[PDB]
DNA sequence: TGCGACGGTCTGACGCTCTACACAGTGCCAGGGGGAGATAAACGAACGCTGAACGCTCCGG
């Protein structure tokens, strides 16, 4: 609310893609009339051509006479966006005039920058502000209801990123001392990702050093269970690294 | 026709890499035809809301 500049444009993309003009929220329209937005943002305004936007939100089997549906679209963006931060270059559509802080992609990157370069000055408290402000900022999961193949592979990037966000989020966490929110928090993304080996590493280290054992090696053995009955393969060896010196008892941890 | 000579025509002028680069002085606008992009509407489609309605276990007086 601190940065709530007057003339301010913001657009929201980590979530359900929206439009705020000064705090008033926009019909976006129709999910296509939304992916194309959301394709023609998360380009940090470069200009993308036609049938490009085409391939995007379509992919391999597109319409014949329906290049003018894009133009509609787009039409319809600079009825609901303002008429010059929409502009056409060489057949294409970009999206131009953005101020800093108006994409929250590019928030979310500024954030994961200074915390890694937090991390490296070795600063706890500036980056688990800049994280916790990085996690305020996706509502539920990105891209919701938008089709396309560049929407999907969009939402699975970003999946991933924020997985890999909180798997650091985490470990800063453990680095500091949170034990409690940490355990709740990583039970409930595990019994939701039930496959994901480094968050199961992440329970392992945190239930060592939080006086919870019994819990972590079923845990474990699950794991391994549901690793070998759904692949046929065995677990990546931190992880066999990691039990084993929990096993011994090694008070480095602790 | 035989003669030299006069002349044009035509050809290549061993092999490779290491190296290896680019190329410069004199007109002007109006009228008209097409297709690129923005517009607002349109015919058809399916997308939702309406809970209703059928049937099940159900705790039960």
């Known amino acids: ?5 007057s003339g301010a444009l913001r657009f929201g993309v980590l979530g359900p893609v929206r439009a705020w003009r000064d705090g008033e929220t926009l019909a976006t329209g129709s999910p296509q009339q939304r992916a194309l937005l959301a394709a023609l943002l998360l ?5 993308a051509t036609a049938g490009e936007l085409i391939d995007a939100l379509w992919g391999e089997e597109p319409p ?7 133009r509609t679209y787009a039409s319809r963006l600079r009825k609901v966006l303002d008429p010059g931060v929409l502009v056409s270059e060489s057949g294409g559509y970009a999206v131009r005039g953005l101020a800093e802080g108006a994409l929250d992609l590019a928030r979310a990157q500024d954030l994961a ?3 890694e ?3 490296s000055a070795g600063d706890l408290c500036h980056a688990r502000d800049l994280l916790r402000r990085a996690l305020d900022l996706w509502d539920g999961e990105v891209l919701a ?5 560049y929407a999907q592979t969009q939402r699975v990037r970003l999946g991933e990123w924020r997985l890999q966000l909180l798997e650091t989020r985490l470990d800063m966490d453990l680095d500091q001392g949170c034990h409690a929110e940490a355990v ?3 039970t409930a993304l595990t019994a939701a990702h039930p496959l994901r080996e ?3 590493e992440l329970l392992m280290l945190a239930l060592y050093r939080s006086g919870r054992q019994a819990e972590a090696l079923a845990v474990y053995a699950d794991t391994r269970r549901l690793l070998a009955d759904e692949l046929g393969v065995d677990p990546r060896p931190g992880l066999q690294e990691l039990q084993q010196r929990i096993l011994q008892a090694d008070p480095a941890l602790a």
Do not use: C, I, N, Y
């Open 43 to 47: 380009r940090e305004g470069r200009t």
């Open 184 to 186: 709740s928090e990583l």
């Open 113 to 115: 920058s200074a915390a």
């Open 1 to 5: 609310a601190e940065e709530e500049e």
């Open 198 to 200: 480094r968050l199961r």
């Open 145 to 149: 209801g938008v089709p396309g193949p």
């Open 64 to 70: 014949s006479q329906a290049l003018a549906a894009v």
């Open 117 to 119: 370069k937090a991390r």
